[model samples]
Target: APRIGILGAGGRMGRILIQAVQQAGYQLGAAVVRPESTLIGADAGELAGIGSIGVKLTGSLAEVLEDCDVVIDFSTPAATSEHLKLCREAGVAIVIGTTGMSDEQKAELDETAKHIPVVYAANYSVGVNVSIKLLELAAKVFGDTVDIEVIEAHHRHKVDAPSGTALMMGEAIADTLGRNLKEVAVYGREGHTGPRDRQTIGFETIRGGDIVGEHTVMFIGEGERVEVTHKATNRMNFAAGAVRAAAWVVGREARKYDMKDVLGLND
Candidate 1:
């Protein structure tokens, strides 16, 4: 089994990854947290609500990467970038689940991929990526005659407006229609707005109480509406996918990949 190191080992996703790492029969090498975090010296397994696995939480990723075969990271943009830098220096592979990264940051990932294996994905839920495949088929069948809208909802504490998964759905649809998302995407409507453009992809984002990431892609036609949806009731789905990606990226060539590669969903 591969030895896995977690970057944000004190966060919600971090703890879940810790537990999932063990569940997937991988060795937990290092559980790194922020330098000032109170859980700095706690057991990674205990903190994750699983029994002790004897791995300590430390803030020193440089030292941890020394022994890790692969890293599972679900952290903030800045934190993910820093972790990726260290991964590059250590010549190690990383499974990145960070979202809201800038275009320049994405370019940096492309640059770093020249040296090490990097499985970069905004969302790692297997079902969600499969939905992208479904959307491709729907777009081909419906064409541009139907109005498209992406509706996403998440917990109140979430920072990003439209979830990254929602953006992915929008991009998938745009590519199918030979359109650029940046040129034709509409975010939100305002007062006194004219009639909706039938050709544009619209996005509606909702942030409310404790909703565990719900996304529904709507294709509204004149006579019928088709809705393709994915609801994440728990974070374990993401953790399991990240773990699988971490294992899959090992011994592979350096490049960017997605869950599609992990699950063999590519056409």
Candidate 2:
């Protein structure tokens, strides 16, 4: 079985990822924490709330570089940048689910992919990917005939106003209709905002307590309204998707891929 490393192993998503990897029958190559983390030396399985699989958390990615076939990263952008380089240097495939990456960080991932396979995505939920596909189909059929709106909700601690998955859905709709998302997206409306523009894709973002993730794309036509919604009750689906991407990207050719590619929903 392929060995998978869980970077940011002490984080909420990281712990779930460790569980997902083990559940998928893959070997736990390493559960990596911060150098100064108190979690260092904790059992990986126990950290994940699983009993114990004997894999202990370590602070060094280099220590497990040789053992990891692919590394799953659900950490911060700054940390992900370093992790990407480490994986690149070690010739290990990586599946990154860290959102809010800067342009430079993304460029680095693109550059690193020239040497090793990289799977990076704003969202790694299979159902969410399918919703993106659905949005694409709806956009093609509706085109400019309907007013499009994307509303997203997440946990209160989420710093980003619009979740990355919400943006992904908007992009899918805008791209299908040949509209530039950056130019046409209207993020939230306030007083003095003019009437809804048919050409614009609007986004409504909400942050509240413990809401995992929820997104709804509404296409309001003259007489009827069509809505495509996806709600993540738990984070396991995202972890499973990340692990699935890890399994698929390993031993593959060097390239950068997203969840659409992993799920074969690109077409």
Candidate 3:
């Protein structure tokens, strides 16, 4: 029942998150859009297509950040940067579900986390992080004996190659074995790439009509293989988990966390 504000209030994930918060019985403090958005002055519940919640959409976080216990962001990189700055200075907790952030953009969390709690994850689905943990265990057992590859697919309008979740999965395995992902990861393969390198973790990304998300990490041996896959048929899993992250961060010590931490997967 924490008071939560949402960024990207005019987007698809934004509406879905309203449904999530409504059903979860959390207090909705604010919903934000771009300064020039036509959606401004609209009731958040109506935008969500879920009836009235008495909260109007605004273009300024400054208009609403004070009363919020936490801010949930699933916005573009540039907007997320600005929102992160505002939330940090206001001493408000935040959950960041924004993907495709560069290493430099992601590092901004390190600074804001010292001031207030921040939950940042490439993807905010319980099962996705669980798969990351499972992949870690499998990677340790298989080592370099199996060929490692991550395959991901998304909706046609989505941007960012390989997907952030795919990169997260690769890093989980790479970190478990004490290797650098940058040195050992392959983005994609084609044109007579010779024999497969056992030491490399490969990636394949697909974009087609209205695929929410589908990801798999495979451990292929000489005659058998294991694929750990998570398919997101809807956006609710992410919306629900993000609300949970808001719950997990409010009143906690100022630090950065992920869905793994929110779901108690780290232990």
Candidate 4:
């Protein structure tokens, strides 16, 4: 019975979330799109190929979030920031699935979370959250003896490289090793890079046609390599996870919660 509002209603993840809200039987309060978007007047349900659910695409976050219990946003950083401000004023909780936000923007988001419940994650895949836990464990048990390299691939249209998930993996490893990611992380090394440094974690990014998303983290040591990977064939996995997170954040009182909390995997 949660009244949910979705930001970026016309985009891929937005459309998927619209269908997920229906499938999960939640009340679709509103679908917030860009001000000049063609979908501003479209019905939310129809946008997901379902019948009308009385929710229309809008550009006004303040108006849409007035009575909304929780808002799920997967829009750009600028749009998400605007929505966050409105959510703060309206005292509505939010679940953010957008990526590519600067550290400054993230600091601002953390400040906003002090007033309203906020769950922000790079990737909303259940498997990915679980993978973070696994990586943490692996890094702790395996230690610096293992050379960690993360490789990720996404669809051609994705603008971000080295993906949020890949960075999360790198962070998990760095945390385990008690090192800063900036100091220990190496991205896209070219020729004459010399020997692979055991203290450095590597990242590789690939983009091609129709690839949904794929990530592999390799822990190489001596004569053996342990690989942990998560491959997403469809966008629905993330959509379903986002819906679950929306339900989890509805009435929460915590200043900040993550997908780990939503899925009950957090330590």
Sorting all predicted structures by lDDT, with the top scorer first, yields: 2, 1, 3, 4
Q: Runs in model 3 with CA error above 4 Å?
A: 34-37, 76-78, 99-109, 144-164, 179-210, 220-225
TM-score for each of the candidates? 0.77, 0.81, 0.77, 0.77
User: Judged by lDDT, which candidate is best?
Assistant: 2
How much does each candidate deviate from the true structure in C-alpha RMSD?
Answer: 3.8, 3.3, 3.8, 3.7
Off by over 4 Å in 1: 35-37, 76-82, 99-107, 144-164, 179-210, 219-226, 234-236
Residues 135-218 of candidate 4 have per-residue lDDT tens digits of 888889899889999999998999987888889789988988898999988888888999988898999999999898899999
Give the distance in Å from residue 113's predicted Cα in candidate 1 to where it truly belongs.
Answer: 1.2
Clashing pairs in 3: none
Model 3 per-residue lDDT tens digits across residues 1-267: 689888898899999888888878998889999989998989999989989889999989987998799989998877888988998788889898887887788888778888889998867887887898899989989887898989999999987988878888888999987789999989877799998877888888989999999999999998999999999977679898898789778999988887888988777
Q: Residue 251 deviation, candidate 3, in Å?
A: 0.5
lDDT of each: 0.89, 0.90, 0.87, 0.87
Better model by lDDT, 3 or 4?
3
Candidate 1, residues 48-103: lDDT per residue as tens digits?
Answer: 99989899999889988978989988888888889889999998899988887888
Candidate no. 4 TM-score: 0.77
